[model samples]
Structure formats: C-alpha cells, structure tokens
Target: EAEAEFTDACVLPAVQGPCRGWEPRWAYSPLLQQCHPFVYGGCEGNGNNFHSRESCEDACPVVDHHHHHH
Candidate 1:
C-alpha cells in the first residue's frame, strides 16, 4: 500500500516597478520561483518577454531535502 502525502506552499509575486540591473535576477518563494524581467531601462514595460512559468522556475534554486520540501 502507498501512503498519501500532503503539502502546502506559497508563491510571492514580484512588485511591478523599475529594478536596477545589479539587483537580484531571480525571485525566490516557497511555491513558485521566477526570474526578474530583463528590463533594459528598468521594469517599465509589460514584460512581454516573460513567456512561460517554467522559464521563471528555472531561475529558482533547486529544492533539496534541506530546503522546503513540504
């Protein structure tokens, strides 16, 4: 027999504003991860280049056993 598992997570959305180039490139959260927009003149546009959620996820650090696995 297999056991059932339960999990809870949270995703924090990035604020819409202008970010400097030296700022962090990725957003870190418990549930979702995202890469900062490649804003040339800061995050002033609609961020059309950000296409898929997966792309954002890629920028996130890998969740390991020591990390939030629940």
Candidate 2:
C-alpha cells in the first residue's frame, strides 16, 4: 500500500515484528501537534502502531507547541 507506507513516514514504527491483536498505537496529529494514543487493529495499521508509550515517545517525539515571540 503506497498510501500506508507514506503515512507510516509520519507514524512511529511498531515495536513488535507482527501485531495480530488490538495494541497501542501512537499517531502525531498536525492539528493536535502532539502524539496521541489509539487502538491498533493489528492489521491494516502501518508501523505507526507502537507497543508502549515509551517506544512511541522515542519514535514520534511530541512537537513542542510553545511559540516564542519575535
């Protein structure tokens, strides 16, 4: 799936080799500007589905939304 792979670019890589059960998935939403946790269907989902919060944090680090005045 070209689209899935492209999307995976933004999504974090999965810790497990192959996931077949509902697991933790992390995704960074541009609008949210932060990584959010979601349920992964095990299939369909790309590498973005992480095994834990730490792993997700390591891969898709949160984007600091604090803005500095120019």
Candidate 3:
C-alpha cells in the first residue's frame, strides 16, 4: 500500500528552514501522535510540512484504535 511511503512524512519533525519568509504551516509529531502548527521559512522544508490543519490531519491522522483499512 502507498500508506507505507506517504505516511513516512508524519514521522519527520517540523522545519522552519533558513529562509526569512514566515509562512504558517502544520506538521505531524510522530512522538506526540498528532499535528501541530509551525512557521515555515517558505523554502527548503521537509515532507512534514502541510498548508493547513485539515491537510495535516488528513495526512497524519491520530493513530488510535479502529483503523480505516484503506
């Protein structure tokens, strides 16, 4: 399943990058098992970066009981 590859982004930490731009973004926290808001540098970000909370949630949903079985 593609889940194995795509879901890997959920494990990466949020990176603000070195650029000066301040773009608000969301990223999943593998350790906390949830998505959190962060500031993006507008470039050089990892796969963990998401444009919105909904998108982040859609990508890295809270891994609780009852799998969707996609």
lDDT of 1 at 9: 17
Per-residue lDDT of model 3, residues 1-70, tens digit only: 2222344877877788889989998998867667889989998979898878789889866545454456
Evaluate model 3: give its lDDT: 0.76
Model 1 lDDT-worst window of ten: 1-10
Q: How does residue 63 of candidate 2 score in lDDT?
A: 40
lDDT winner = 3
Q: Write the per-residue lDDT of candidate 1 for residues 1-70, one digit (tens) a residue.
A: 0011122111344443665553223333443232444323246533223334455555343454453333
Clashing pairs in 3: none
Clashes of 1: 0
Task: Using lDDT as the measure, name the better of candidate 1 and candidate 2.
Answer: 2
TM-score of 2: 0.45
Better of 2 and 3 by lDDT: 3
How many clashes in each candidate? Answer: 0, 0, 0
